[PDB]
Amino acid sequence: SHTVLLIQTSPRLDSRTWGDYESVTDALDALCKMFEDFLSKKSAAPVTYDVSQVYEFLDKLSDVSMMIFNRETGQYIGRTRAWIKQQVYEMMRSEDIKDSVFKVLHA
Amino acid sequence: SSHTVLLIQTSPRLDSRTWGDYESVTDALDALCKMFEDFLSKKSAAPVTYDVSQVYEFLDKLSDVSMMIFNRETGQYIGRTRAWIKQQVYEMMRGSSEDIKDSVFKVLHA
Protein backbone atom coordinates (compact mmCIF):
# COMPACT_ATOMS: atom_id res chain seq x y z
CA SER A 1 0.00 0.00 0.00
CA HIS A 2 1.80 3.08 -1.35
CA THR A 3 1.93 5.70 1.40
CA VAL A 4 2.72 9.43 1.29
CA LEU A 5 4.00 10.97 4.52
CA LEU A 6 3.15 14.69 4.73
CA ILE A 7 5.17 16.58 7.34
CA GLN A 8 5.39 20.26 8.23
CA THR A 9 8.15 20.75 10.80
CA SER A 10 7.67 24.42 11.72
CA PRO A 11 4.78 26.94 11.43
CA ARG A 12 6.32 28.14 8.15
CA LEU A 13 4.51 26.83 5.09
CA ASP A 14 7.92 26.33 3.45
CA SER A 15 8.77 23.68 6.06
CA ARG A 16 6.28 21.35 4.36
CA THR A 17 8.06 18.31 2.92
CA TRP A 18 7.02 14.77 2.05
CA GLY A 19 8.27 11.27 1.48
CA ASP A 20 6.58 8.19 0.10
CA TYR A 21 6.87 4.54 0.98
CA GLU A 22 5.93 1.06 -0.20
CA SER A 23 3.70 0.52 2.86
CA VAL A 24 2.35 2.20 5.98
CA THR A 25 4.73 0.04 8.01
CA ASP A 26 7.76 1.68 6.40
CA ALA A 27 6.15 5.12 6.67
CA LEU A 28 5.54 4.61 10.40
CA ASP A 29 8.98 3.09 10.86
CA ALA A 30 10.34 6.23 9.20
CA LEU A 31 8.63 8.32 11.88
CA CYS A 32 10.14 6.06 14.56
CA LYS A 33 13.60 6.58 13.07
CA MET A 34 12.97 10.33 13.02
CA PHE A 35 11.96 10.25 16.70
CA GLU A 36 14.90 8.18 17.91
CA ASP A 37 17.29 10.14 15.72
CA PHE A 38 15.90 13.28 17.39
CA LEU A 39 16.17 11.99 20.98
CA SER A 40 19.67 10.68 20.28
CA LYS A 41 20.58 14.04 18.69
CA LYS A 42 19.48 15.68 21.98
CA SER A 43 21.49 13.84 24.66
CA ALA A 44 25.27 13.61 24.91
CA ALA A 45 24.27 10.24 26.36
CA PRO A 46 22.71 6.89 25.48
CA VAL A 47 19.12 7.84 26.31
CA THR A 48 15.99 5.76 26.92
CA TYR A 49 12.47 7.08 26.48
CA ASP A 50 8.98 7.13 27.97
CA VAL A 51 5.75 6.75 26.01
CA SER A 52 4.91 10.42 26.56
CA GLN A 53 8.03 11.34 24.59
CA VAL A 54 7.15 9.74 21.26
CA TYR A 55 3.75 11.47 21.50
CA GLU A 56 5.33 14.82 22.39
CA PHE A 57 7.72 14.36 19.47
CA LEU A 58 4.83 13.99 17.03
CA ASP A 59 3.04 16.96 18.65
CA LYS A 60 6.03 19.23 18.05
CA LEU A 61 5.42 18.77 14.32
CA SER A 62 3.18 21.59 13.15
CA ASP A 63 1.51 19.15 10.74
CA VAL A 64 1.81 15.43 10.08
CA SER A 65 -0.50 13.12 8.13
CA MET A 66 -0.44 10.16 5.76
CA MET A 67 -2.09 9.29 2.47
CA ILE A 68 -2.43 5.51 2.25
CA PHE A 69 -3.39 3.81 -0.99
CA ASN A 70 -6.33 1.42 -0.63
CA ARG A 71 -6.02 -1.22 -3.34
CA GLU A 72 -9.71 -2.14 -3.03
CA THR A 73 -10.87 1.38 -3.99
CA GLY A 74 -7.85 2.66 -5.92
CA GLN A 75 -7.93 5.78 -3.73
CA TYR A 76 -5.84 7.14 -0.87
CA ILE A 77 -7.06 7.07 2.73
CA GLY A 78 -6.12 10.12 4.78
CA ARG A 79 -4.87 9.56 8.33
CA THR A 80 -4.14 12.45 10.68
CA ARG A 81 -2.05 12.98 13.79
CA ALA A 82 -4.35 11.13 16.22
CA TRP A 83 -4.31 7.91 14.17
CA ILE A 84 -0.57 8.12 13.45
CA LYS A 85 0.23 8.51 17.15
CA GLN A 86 -1.73 5.34 17.95
CA GLN A 87 0.05 3.45 15.18
CA VAL A 88 3.51 4.77 16.06
CA TYR A 89 2.69 3.82 19.65
CA GLU A 90 1.76 0.22 18.93
CA MET A 91 4.88 -0.19 16.76
CA MET A 92 7.14 1.14 19.51
CA ARG A 93 7.07 -1.22 22.49
CA SER A 94 13.39 24.53 17.56
CA GLU A 95 14.80 23.89 14.10
CA ASP A 96 16.62 20.81 15.42
CA ILE A 97 13.54 18.72 14.58
CA LYS A 98 13.78 19.57 10.86
CA ASP A 99 17.23 17.97 10.71
CA SER A 100 15.86 14.77 12.22
CA VAL A 101 12.98 14.76 9.70
CA PHE A 102 15.21 15.37 6.69
CA LYS A 103 17.72 12.72 7.78
CA VAL A 104 15.28 9.82 7.30
CA LEU A 105 12.84 11.42 4.84
CA HIS A 106 15.39 12.39 2.18
CA ALA A 107 18.24 9.88 2.39
CA SER B 1 -15.44 22.26 -3.58
CA SER B 2 -13.05 19.37 -2.80
CA HIS B 3 -9.79 19.39 -0.85
CA THR B 4 -6.61 18.85 -2.88
CA VAL B 5 -3.01 18.06 -1.95
CA LEU B 6 -0.44 19.23 -4.51
CA LEU B 7 2.79 17.20 -4.39
CA ILE B 8 5.90 18.60 -6.09
CA GLN B 9 9.54 17.55 -6.32
CA THR B 10 11.28 20.43 -8.09
CA SER B 11 14.62 18.67 -8.72
CA PRO B 12 16.12 15.16 -8.51
CA ARG B 13 17.11 15.84 -4.88
CA LEU B 14 14.78 14.15 -2.38
CA ASP B 15 15.01 17.21 -0.12
CA SER B 16 13.30 19.13 -2.95
CA ARG B 17 9.97 17.36 -2.32
CA THR B 18 7.40 19.87 -1.05
CA TRP B 19 3.63 20.23 -0.92
CA GLY B 20 0.67 22.54 -0.57
CA ASP B 21 -3.02 21.95 0.00
CA TYR B 22 -6.02 23.76 -1.42
CA GLU B 23 -9.75 23.99 -0.89
CA SER B 24 -10.28 23.33 -4.60
CA VAL B 25 -8.86 21.52 -7.61
CA THR B 26 -9.18 24.86 -9.41
CA ASP B 27 -7.04 26.50 -6.74
CA ALA B 28 -4.40 23.78 -7.10
CA LEU B 29 -4.36 24.10 -10.90
CA ASP B 30 -4.36 27.90 -10.60
CA ALA B 31 -1.39 27.58 -8.24
CA LEU B 32 0.60 25.67 -10.86
CA CYS B 33 -0.21 28.38 -13.43
CA LYS B 34 1.08 31.06 -11.08
CA MET B 35 4.26 29.04 -10.58
CA PHE B 36 4.74 29.03 -14.34
CA GLU B 37 3.91 32.74 -14.58
CA ASP B 38 6.50 33.47 -11.89
CA PHE B 39 9.00 31.35 -13.81
CA LEU B 40 8.10 33.10 -17.08
CA SER B 41 8.61 36.55 -15.53
CA LYS B 42 12.25 35.74 -14.76
CA LYS B 43 13.18 35.19 -18.42
CA SER B 44 15.63 37.77 -19.75
CA ALA B 45 13.46 39.14 -22.58
CA ALA B 46 10.39 37.21 -23.76
CA PRO B 47 7.15 38.01 -25.58
CA VAL B 48 4.17 39.14 -23.48
CA THR B 49 2.15 36.09 -24.53
CA TYR B 50 2.53 32.37 -23.90
CA ASP B 51 1.09 29.13 -25.24
CA VAL B 52 -0.11 26.21 -23.11
CA SER B 53 2.84 24.35 -24.63
CA GLN B 54 5.12 26.48 -22.45
CA VAL B 55 3.09 25.56 -19.36
CA TYR B 56 3.57 21.92 -20.37
CA GLU B 57 7.35 22.30 -20.56
CA PHE B 58 7.31 23.93 -17.14
CA LEU B 59 5.44 20.96 -15.69
CA ASP B 60 7.95 18.70 -17.48
CA LYS B 61 10.86 20.34 -15.66
CA LEU B 62 9.48 19.21 -12.29
CA SER B 63 10.87 15.83 -11.25
CA ASP B 64 7.48 15.04 -9.72
CA VAL B 65 4.07 16.68 -9.70
CA SER B 66 0.79 15.02 -8.73
CA MET B 67 -2.51 15.75 -6.98
CA MET B 68 -4.60 13.94 -4.38
CA ILE B 69 -8.20 15.13 -4.77
CA PHE B 70 -10.84 14.50 -2.12
CA ASN B 71 -13.71 12.33 -3.37
CA ARG B 72 -16.78 13.53 -1.48
CA GLU B 73 -18.56 10.31 -2.47
CA THR B 74 -16.00 7.97 -0.87
CA GLY B 75 -14.17 10.20 1.59
CA GLN B 76 -10.90 9.11 -0.04
CA TYR B 77 -8.46 10.86 -2.37
CA ILE B 78 -8.15 10.09 -6.06
CA GLY B 79 -4.57 10.38 -7.23
CA ARG B 80 -3.85 12.23 -10.46
CA THR B 81 -0.54 12.53 -12.29
CA ARG B 82 1.16 14.92 -14.68
CA ALA B 83 -0.66 14.17 -17.95
CA TRP B 84 -4.08 14.65 -16.34
CA ILE B 85 -2.89 17.87 -14.71
CA LYS B 86 -1.68 19.10 -18.12
CA GLN B 87 -5.08 18.47 -19.71
CA GLN B 88 -6.83 20.27 -16.83
CA VAL B 89 -4.47 23.25 -17.00
CA TYR B 90 -5.07 23.36 -20.76
CA GLU B 91 -8.83 23.30 -20.20
CA MET B 92 -8.52 26.10 -17.64
CA MET B 93 -6.49 28.24 -20.04
CA ARG B 94 -8.98 28.08 -22.92
CA GLY B 95 -11.62 29.41 -20.50
CA SER B 96 17.24 26.64 -14.13
CA SER B 97 16.93 24.19 -11.24
CA GLU B 98 17.27 26.87 -8.55
CA ASP B 99 14.91 29.18 -10.45
CA ILE B 100 12.28 26.44 -10.66
CA LYS B 101 12.40 25.71 -6.93
CA ASP B 102 12.17 29.46 -6.25
CA SER B 103 9.06 29.86 -8.42
CA VAL B 104 7.39 26.83 -6.81
CA PHE B 105 8.17 27.92 -3.24
CA LYS B 106 7.11 31.53 -3.91
CA VAL B 107 3.55 30.53 -4.90
CA LEU B 108 3.12 27.25 -2.98
CA HIS B 109 4.19 28.73 0.36
CA ALA B 110 2.77 32.28 0.07
Numbering used by the authors:
A (entry chain A): 5 to 97, 124 to 137
B (entry chain B): 4 to 98, 123 to 137
Give the original sentences from the paper that presented this experimental model.
By using functional proteomics, we and another group independently identified a piRNA biogenesis and chromosome segregation (PICS) complex (also named as PETISCO) that plays important roles in 21U-RNA biogenesis, chromosome segregation and cell division. The PICS complex is composed of TOFU-6, PICS-1 (also names as PID-3), ERH-2 and two mutually exclusive factors, PID-1 and TOST-1.
The overall structure is a tetramer formed by ERH-2 and EBM in a 2:2 ratio. The EBMC is accommodated into a v-shape concave via contacting with both ERH-2 molecules, ERH-2A and ERH-2B, respectively. EBMC mainly interacts with the β1, β2, α1, and α2 of ERH-2A, and extensive hydrophobic interactions are found throughout their binding interface. On one side, I182, V186, Phe187, and Leu190 of EBMC make hydrophobic interactions with Ile11, Thr13, Met38, Phe42, Phe61, and Leu65 of ERH-2A; on the other side, Val189 of EBMC is accommodated into a hydrophobic pocket composed of Ala34, Lys37, and Met38 of ERH-2A. ITC binding data indicate that neither of EBM double mutants, I182D/V186D and V189D/L190D, displayed ERH-2 binding affinity, which highlights  the roles of  hydrophobic residues in binding to ERH-2.
